[PDB]
Structure formats: C-alpha cells, structure tokens
Design a protein around this nucleic acid. Structure first.
Lengths: 141, 72, 99, 107, 97, 49, 216
RNA sequence: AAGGUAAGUAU
C-alpha cells in the first residue's frame, strides 16, 4: 500500500497507462485506508517484484483522483484494472463484471495467474481474457 | 613453557592436551588432525544416534573458543 | 437549491444526532479502555527513538537472504511419466493360477 | 626471482606469479557475463516507491485511520480528529462539452 | 497489516529522514526478517541494529506473534466446528498450526 | 539376518513392493520420486548388492 | 481501625512520583511550555501497600546464538530496581503515558512480593516464565529506602519464609508452596496433600509468583 | 436483481 508507486492526478494515470508499451499496467483504484484495499495492496506488494518483467503496478486514490470515477464506475471499495498499450483489458472472471476486479484476493498466486493471462491475451491482441479461475463462487466449503 | 599455545587456547585445555599427548615435544610432533582427537572419550550411544553423542570430540572441541560457536 | 435539501436532511437527522454521537463516544472510550490503540502501544518505544543519532541511523545494515541459489531460484522441476513397468506390473496382477 | 610463464611465454617476477596465473586465464566470457549483468541492472526500474513516497503515503494513511493512529477516533475514512472538478463520463457525445468545461475552469 | 503500518510510520516519523530516506524500505525488510526469524524459530540478532529500533521491532514481533497464535487457533476451531472456509484459508491455517 | 538367509530375497522384494505402492496410481513423477524409483529398480536388478 | 493485625504486619508505606508524559506529536517549544505549565510535572503522592508488585522482563522471544532455547532469568535486585528515584517506568494508558517512579518509605515487618505473571496481552493471557534469581538467606533493602527514612528503619534485611510457585500454563496451572520451618530452618513444599522435603537451594530455581519475607 | 457482455479491425 505504502510501498507501491502512487499516482496523484488524472494526467499521471494517463501517462502511466500510455508509457508502458510491453508490460501490462495494473492500477488499483481505491483508498490506502480501506481494509479491502489494504489486503489487495499487500498482495500486490507481495507479487510486485515477481511480475516486474511483464507488469507494472500503480496505486491511485479515487478521492484524490476522482477523474475516472464516472467512466470506470470506480465506486466499489477496491478496484483492480489492467491496461495494455493504452487499452483497457477485460477479464471473464465469472463475476458478471468483466471490466475490473472489485474484491480483495487472498492468494498471491491467483493474482500472478491473472496478470500472466492478461499479458498473454493482450500481446496476442485480444481485448478479453478468460481467467484461469472462475470467481462465480468463493469455493468455501 | 607454552606461551603461544596458552594464548590460542586456555591454559586448562592447554594442560589437558599437553598431559595426554605426552609433553610439549610429543604434542608438537603430532599431526594437526590427531590433536583435535586428544582426550576423546568413546561415549556409548544409549539408543540415541551417533551424532547426538558427538563422536570424535576432544579437549579442543570442548575448549572455550570452540564452545563459543553455534553447534552447527 | 441543493443546499436547501442538504440542510433539510441535516435537520431531519438532528433528532438524535447528539444523543447517538455521544453514546458512540462512550462506546469508543470503553473499547479503548480494554484494547488500546496500536500507536499508543508503541508510544514509549517511539519516544525512545530520540536517542538514536544520525550516524547510528546510517549504521543500520541491509537485510540479506541466508538460503543459497538452489533454494532461492531452483531450476525447473521436470515432470516425467511413470515407467511402463508400472503398467506391466498392474497388468500382471489379476492373472490367477488355475490350481 | 624471475619465472617463465607457462601461459604467456614471458618472464615475470616471482612475487606476481600467483596473480599472473589467476588473471592470465580469466575467461573473457566472464567479462561478457558481467557486462550483460550490469547492462540489465542499470536499465532496471524501481518497482517500489522511494523513501519520500513511502513516508508520505504512511502519513496520509495515518491521517485517515484514526482507529490506529492519533488521539481522537473518528470513522475509518474520515480525516477529522466552491469548486468541483468536471470529469468526463466516457461518452463520445460529451467530449466537446467536457473539454470546454475543463478549458472554462482555467483562471 | 495495521501493525506493520503503525510500526513503520512510527519508525519513519522518528527517523531523521532528511538525509536517510533510503533506509525506509530497509526498515521494513528488518520487520520481515525478525518476523520470519520468529516463525522459523531461529535466533534473530542484528549486530548493527540500534537498541531502540531493535526493542520496537521486538515489540512488533511479539504483538504480531500473539495475534498470529490467536488467529491460528481461532481459525482451527472454526474449521473443526464446521465453519465454511476457503482452500487458501485452510492452507494458511495448516501452515500456522 | 544371516548372509545365507533362506528368505533374504523374498523379504527384499516385499519391501521394494511396498515402496513402489505409493506410485501404483499413475501420476507425474518429480525428481525425488523418480530418484526413489531408480533406487528401487537398482535394488531389484541387483538384489545381492 | 488504622492499625489492625494486617496493617502492622504486612502494610508498608511507599511514595510515588507521578509525572505526566507529553504527547510525542507536539512541537518542542510547545512540549517545553506544556512542561512549564505544571500540567506535566511530578506530583509526590504517598500511599500504603499490603504487598509490593514486581514487574518481570519480557521473554527473550528468540533462541540464543550459542545455547538455543535458554531459559530466561533475571536477578532479584534487577526486578527490585523499582521503588527508587533513579529508575522510572513509563506506564502507558489508552489516553496518555505517565512517568511514575516509586520510593519506599516504611518497610513492613513482613514484606510480601507479588511477581507479575499472567499478563493479558492484546489477544489473550500469557505467563512470563522468567526465572527469578533471588537469595533465600540474606538481603538488604537499605539502598531501596529514601535517605530521610533510612535512619528511621535500622533494619532492611529480609529472609524468605514462604514461596508460591505456579506450574503450567495460565489456562490450567497448579499452585505449589514452599514453607520454611521457623523452628528447624528446613524447607518443606506441600502441594495439597503431597508434602516433600525440597532442599533450600532448590527453592530459588522455580517460577516464583508470591513470596513472604521476614525482617527478623 | 444478478453471478448469461465474444473480442477485433473500419467509417
């Protein structure tokens, strides 16, 4: 949360999405103080170095940067969104919202798998990638 | 009699190795591999493994400087 | 005109705003009596950091990893099929003597 | 003293013999490997935030989570204890009005 | 997470970071290794670590260890009772136990 | 166990069979599993050694 | 009555210097002016006690470099570093911290030491297993009395006569007692029905919880 | 009420 790079205005988010040409930009829209956001940010920090080759992770404060709240529907407590070559990438998570990940994921391997799948699909030119795990159920038993 | 050897290791261990080796001359004529085994009691393993009994261990091993190290 | 409706909503909330923001104050105080805040649990230690000089601060060492290359970055663990002799041996079973 | 080189065919001082053998056969692909290990290291980016950013983020988080920090305890997200920015809604029909409103907000 | 954030904020606040900002990340690394050294049941004694810093890191490790033990036991009792839990939660709880 | 034991080989085969029972179900073998299977096969090929 | 059989036997008099520690997140000039405002200054308050509560050091929490898993021990006089003007104890409260240094005034004829175990941490209650290193024959508390009252109390030597020890975790633990036979000088432990003759030296190698001392 | 949006070029 306090270790990952932070974007402080809409122009910085624009440049961060535009700058990367061979890596998927992973942006967490939310608040540092949000417990869901703290879990998501600590998972991202855990996998921040491992995905250095094919991913860059930034953190955006929606209260400080409400520039994308209207278009991206950034109204959930936490949101994770992927961009590739200035192009939002959708994920068939099975949750009904393919445009974003709007919950905290516990396992750090699942996020790595999602980023890897997004990178593969986007480099192949796709705009939608089917996630390796179906999140229509939390698999709680 | 043995200032350097008493500097390296304590005089207690110095005396215990000099007495068991037969004197300063006999201990100086002894190979370095045979000095570490001076005063090595063949402790009988009582069910336990040989490593627990610390085999091939002598005054040097039980000296102050060696015992001031982690067991590994 | 938005301010009119906002003030109207605040006025309607004014029914028990003082009587419920006061009870929550006592609840917070009672909770903190038993479970103090995390920052206050380190207040004395945080106070004692004033005696660490700048050179001592610079003398903090960088953390390294004890485990070696074989554990930090192991080579890929190749998976190989079970030998054919296992199929053969499973096949031997079930062949029964006639006597 | 002076010694003949078994690796170079030249006479060398006796004191430099050990280092002469040690670095007279330094495999040049070791230098290549070190070069490519340093070229990638220079080009590496900063995954994490710098010290200033970490400190500022920690203070900003503390300014909101008053159930951990501070003395008084407000809600989880409240900081205690005009102009509203115009933002595009993501529709092509409203690009012009949003752009002009952004222009019209400059003092 | 809240404990790590609080300890790091306190250390960085008392740190005269006008010259030593680059140590900040290093500090967190210590807060990891000590914790790991407690989880690995191995000795942890940094020789260059100042005594107040080591004392607060030890306090943080003790608090986190108390929370860790309580959470592990609570989750284990939940699972034993029959509480509906995830696979990752089960793996983490098994590791803690 | 004597060197000329009448059952020195039958017991060895029984012991190796139990060690290979963990692999009776077909599965992908990693390095440790295939090393153990190689050791078992070597013991079976040269029972006296 | 002011002087009952418990006051003249167990009760002593202790002095407390309670200084209010300022909040750390304050300006240095503001800190010193708050100190000058008399709000954050020492306030000598006398009091009486039936027993002296002795705080123990925190467990090492780690293995030693050489002897892994070494039992933690502390000398008694280090525990009794309390009750003097030199040392201070930062008592932390959810509101604010305080600096309360103690100073003994009148030592009772029979002094009870209650060693602080079973401390409730943030999540449960844990016992501090630190072994107290104390003598059982002769001590001296003259260094633990203020100079004004040192003349008044000519005797400061106490002998251990009773010792309580708690065995087991705080969830379920047994309370054993070692009692010194005053007539014979021997030490006998009795756990309920069981009575055994423990050597006096082996008394101090226990996790003491409550002790009774006699000044003679 | 949902967990049922193919994505991609072109105006």
């Amino acid at each position: 949360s306090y270790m990952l790079p932070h974007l402080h205005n809409g122009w910085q988010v624009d440049q961060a999405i535009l700058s990367e040409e061979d890596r998927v930009v992973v942006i967490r829209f939310g608040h540092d103080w949000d417990p869901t956001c703290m879990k998501m940010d600590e998972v991202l920090y855990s996998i921040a170095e491992k995905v250095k080759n094919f991913a860059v992770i930034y953190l955006v404060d929606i209260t400080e940067v409400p520039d994308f709240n209207k278009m991206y529907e950034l109204y959930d407590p936490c949101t994770v969104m992927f961009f590739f070559r200035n192009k939002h990438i959708m994920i068939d998570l099975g949750t009904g919202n393919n445009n974003k990940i709007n919950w905290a994921m516990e396992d750090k391997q699942e996020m790595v798998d999602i980023i890897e799948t997004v990178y593969r699909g986007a480099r192949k030119g796709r705009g939608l990638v089917v996630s390796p795990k179906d999140y229509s159920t939390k698999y709680r038993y | 009699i043995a200032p350097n050897l008493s500097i390296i290791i304590g005089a207690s261990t110095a005396a215990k190795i000099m007495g068991v080796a037969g004197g300063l001359t006999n201990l100086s004529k002894m190979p370095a591999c045979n000095i570490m085994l001076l005063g090595a009691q063949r402790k009988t393993l009582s069910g336990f493994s040989s490593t627990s009994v610390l085999p091939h261990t002598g005054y040097i091993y039980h000296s102050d400087i060696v015992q001031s190290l982690p067991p590994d | 005109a938005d301010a009119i409706y906002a003030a109207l909503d605040k006025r309607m909330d004014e029914r028990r705003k003082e009587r419920r923001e006061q009870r929550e104050k006592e609840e917070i105080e009672k909770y903190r009596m038993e479970r103090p805040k995390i920052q206050q649990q380190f207040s004395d230690l945080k106070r004692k950091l004033a005696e660490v000089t700048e050179e001592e601060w610079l003398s903090i060492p960088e953390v390294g990893d004890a485990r070696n290359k074989r554990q930090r970055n192991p080579r890929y663990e190749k998976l190989t099929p079970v030998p054919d002799s296992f199929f053969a041996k499973h096949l031997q079973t079930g062949e029964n003597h006639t006597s | 003293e002076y010694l003949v080189s078994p690796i170079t065919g030249e006479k060398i001082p006796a004191s430099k013999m050990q280092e002469h053998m040690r670095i007279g056969l330094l495999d040049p692909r070791w230098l290549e490997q070190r070069d490519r290990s340093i070229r990638e290291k220079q080009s590496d980016d900063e995954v994490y935030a710098p010290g200033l950013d970490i400190e500022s983020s920690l203070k900003q988080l503390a300014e909101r989570r008053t159930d951990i920090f501070g003395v008084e305890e407000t809600a989880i997200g409240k900081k205690i204890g005009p102009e509203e920015k115009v933002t595009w809604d993501g529709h092509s029909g409203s690009m012009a009005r949003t752009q002009q409103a952004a222009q019209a907000n400059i003092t | 997470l809240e404990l790590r954030a609080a300890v790091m904020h306190d250390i960085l606040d008392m740190m005269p970071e006008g010259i030593k900002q680059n140590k900040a990340r290093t500090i967190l690394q210590h807060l990891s290794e000590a914790w790991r050294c407690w989880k690995a049941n191995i000795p942890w004694k940094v020789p260059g670590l100042p005594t107040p810093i080591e004392n607060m890191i030890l306090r943080y490790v003790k608090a986190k260890a108390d929370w860790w033990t309580n959470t592990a036991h609570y989750n284990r009792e939940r699972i034993r009772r029959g509480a509906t839990v995830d696979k990752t939660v089960c793996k983490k709880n098994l590791g803690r136990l | 166990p004597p060197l000329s034991y009448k059952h020195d080989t039958k017991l060895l085969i029984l012991a190796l069979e139990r060690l290979k029972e963990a692999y009776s179900v077909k599965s992908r073998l990693n390095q440790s599993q295939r090393e153990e299977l190689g050791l078992i096969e070597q013991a079976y090929d040269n029972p006296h050694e | 009555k002011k002087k009952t059989i418990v006051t003249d036997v167990f009760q002593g008099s202790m002095r407390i210097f309670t200084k209010k520690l300022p909040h750390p997140d304050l300006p240095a000039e503001e800190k010193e002016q708050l100190l000058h405002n008399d709000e954050y200054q020492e306030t000598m308050v006398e009091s009486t006690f039936m027993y002296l509560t002795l705080d123990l050091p925190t467990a090492p929490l780690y293995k030693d470099e050489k002897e892994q898993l070494i039992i933690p021990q502390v000398p008694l006089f280090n525990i009794l570093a309390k009750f003097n003007g030199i040392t201070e104890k930062e008592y932390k409260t959810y509101k604010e911290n305080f600096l309360k240094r103690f100073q003994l005034t009148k030592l009772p004829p029979y002094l009870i030491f209650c060693i602080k175990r079973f401390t409730k941490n943030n999540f449960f209650v844990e016992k501090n297993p630190t072994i107290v290193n104390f003598p059982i024959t002769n001590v001296d508390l003259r260094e633990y009395l203020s100079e004004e009252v040192q003349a008044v109390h000519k005797n400061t030597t106490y002998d251990l006569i009773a010792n309580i020890v708690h065995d087991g975790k705080p969830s379920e633990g047994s309370y054993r007692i070692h009692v010194l036979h005053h007539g014979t000088g021997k030490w006998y432990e009795l756990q309920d029905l069981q009575v055994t003759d423990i050597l006096p030296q082996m008394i101090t190698l226990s996790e003491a919880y409550i002790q009774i001392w006699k000044r003679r």
